[PDB]
């Protein structure tokens, strides 16, 4: 049996694993580029298989600067494996980026807003296509080699903190679930943590609209935005288009910014 993956790619390293999958960095032999390749073992459940096959077809249609870039998808039956070849991001994701910036000086307003705008625009792209993310969190947000923000479903398991209340309670939901996730991410970008204990305590309070007093005073506009985004009632949350048009996102600049 000839394995498509082993014939066409030189394996470099394992990047991690999560859910049905394992992810590898591998060099394509013919084109000489390095790719991220997710190998998903298809489950012994027809409805879960149905979903997986739908999801791969749906991602193959997607093209946006803030969405992870697709190359190929294929099946191998040596257990059936689905391989998905995407553009290789940097190893450190948004979660790691925030854990390496634990002071207020390292979270300058315009830098965080620039990053948040990229995420929000990726989300708005999905919503405009009648899609949603459902699982938006910092560990699902990576960077390209040139620091362009990339949203995907990375599935590297090393959390329900960013999940809307309607999902946590297992109720039906709408694209508005992603707006709830964005609210928490915006807060987290602007508010650096020293310990994981502090992070969990504070983010839990923020979910319930309890804010650190020094955050409300420093960032009054962003405070209002986060409140609205974190409404318990999904209807009350603003559309992604209304967030990206907010005044705080105009003329964003910082020393070192591209172009
Ligand atoms: C450094 C590094 C580490 C891991 C990486 C993983 C990926 C990656 C790979 C290799 C494959 C797929 C994705 C991805 O984002 C996925 C996406 C996805 C989600 C939103 C936007 C774009 C893609 N989907 C839907 N699915 C999916 C496929 C089948 C079943 C369920 C989910 C995904 O796996 C994905 N993020 C890409 C680059 C990586 N770079």
Curated annotation (Swiss-Prot):
Ubiquitous. A high level expression is seen in secretory tissues. The modification Phosphotyrosine is found at residue 35. Induction: By endoplasmic reticulum stress. Coiled coil: none annotated. It comes from the Eukaryota. Autophosphorylated at Tyr-35 following endoplasmic reticulum stress, leading to activate its activity. Dephosphorylated at Tyr-35 by PTPN1/PTP1B, leading to inactivate its enzyme activity. The active site is at 135 (proton acceptor). Changing residue 74 to S: In WRS; uncertain significance. ATP binds at residues 15-23, 38. Forms dimers with HSPA5/BIP in resting cells. Homotetramerizes in response to endoplasmic reticulum (ER) stress, leading to its activation. Interacts with HSP90B1/GRP94. Interacts with DNAJC3; inhibiting EIF2AK3/PERK activity. Interacts with ATAD3A; ATAD3A and EIF2S1/eIF-2-alpha occupy a common binding site within the cytoplasmic loop of EIF2AK3/PERK, leading to prevent EIF2AK3/PERK association with its substrate EIF2S1/eIF-2-alpha. Interacts with MFN2. Interacts with TMEM33. Interacts with PDIA6. Interacts with LACC1. It is linked to Wolcott-Rallison syndrome: A rare autosomal recessive disorder, characterized by permanent neonatal or early infancy insulin-dependent diabetes and, at a later age, epiphyseal dysplasia, osteoporosis, growth retardation and other multisystem manifestations, such as hepatic and renal dysfunctions, intellectual disability and cardiovascular abnormalities. Belongs to the protein kinase superfamily. Ser/Thr protein kinase family. GCN2 subfamily. This is Eukaryotic translation initiation factor 2-alpha kinase 3. The lineage of its organism: Eukaryota, Metazoa, Chordata, Craniata, Vertebrata. The gene is EIF2AK3. The chain holds residues 585 to 1087 of 1116 of the full protein.
